[PDB]
Amino acid sequence: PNDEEEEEVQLKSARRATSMDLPMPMRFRHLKKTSKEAVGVYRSPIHGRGLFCKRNIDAGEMVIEYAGNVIRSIQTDKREKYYDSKGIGCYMFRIDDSEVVDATMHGNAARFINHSCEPNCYSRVINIDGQKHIVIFAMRKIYRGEELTYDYKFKLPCNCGAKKCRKFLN
């Protein structure tokens, strides 16, 4: 039976590019589509709504982009004011002292990532084709059903599960 099979190509599960040891732009290229399969927003025991794993995520894998428009740091106060006056919930992520991502109007599911003192995700800024993106990566293998969390690293109380909880977000 294995006779015709002696020369056949052996097959196995394909590894996702988001999870492979490739240069960042190759990894980032299919992040949008892959992220939709990997994570979803559900109610969270930590706070309100959270981001959850729908399909196992590899350690070190690109999980999702913190999507939004890159804006100058000095446009930030005015936009917050404007969102306030309109009854819009503001979501922003600082890139550095000069730039932030504004996810308020053109954001995605990454806005719903809760804080935890014992996180399973971390963030990086990457430049792809001249454009800055904030990308969330998994610190460890993450399994279907687990909540994805990040350390905000900012008083106001902390609701994370952590045994080493810091008790306050800030």
Ligand X SMILES: Nc1ncnc2c1ncn2[C@@H]1O[C@H](CSCC[C@H](N)C(=O)O)[C@@H](O)[C@H]1O
**Which residue number, 57 or 117, has a Cβ lying nearer to Zn ion?**
117
Site string for ligand X, 106-125 (x = CB under 6 A): ------x-xxx---------
**Which residue number, 28 or 91, has a Cβ lying nearer to ligand X?**
91
Nearest to 135 by CA among 19, 28, 52: 28
**Which residue number, 72 or 163, has a Cβ lying nearer to Zn ion?**
163
- The reply to whether 159 sits in an annotated binding site is yes
Bridge-based pairing state of the strands 69-72 and 39-43: unpaired
User: Site for Zn ion (CB under 5 A): which residue of 158, 163, 168, 170?
Assistant: 158
CA distance 69 to 130: 14
- The reply to whether 49 sits in an annotated binding site is yes
User: Site for ligand X (CB under 6 A): which residue of 48, 74, 129, 130?
Assistant: 48
Give backbone dihedrals phi and psi of 115, rounded to 5 degrees, phi first. Answer: -80, 150
One-letter amino acid identity for 19?
S
User: Where in 112-131 is the site for Zn ion (CB under 5 A)?
Assistant: 117
Q: What ranges make up the beta strands (E) of the chain?
A: 39-43, 49-53, 62-65, 69-72, 92-94, 99-102, 114-115, 121-128, 131-138, 147-150
Q: Of the ranges 41-49, 51-59, 134-142, 160-168, which one interacts with Zn ion (CB under 5 A)?
A: 160-168
Please enumerate, by residue number, every residue annotated as part of a binding site: 47, 49, 91, 114-115, 117, 158-160, 165
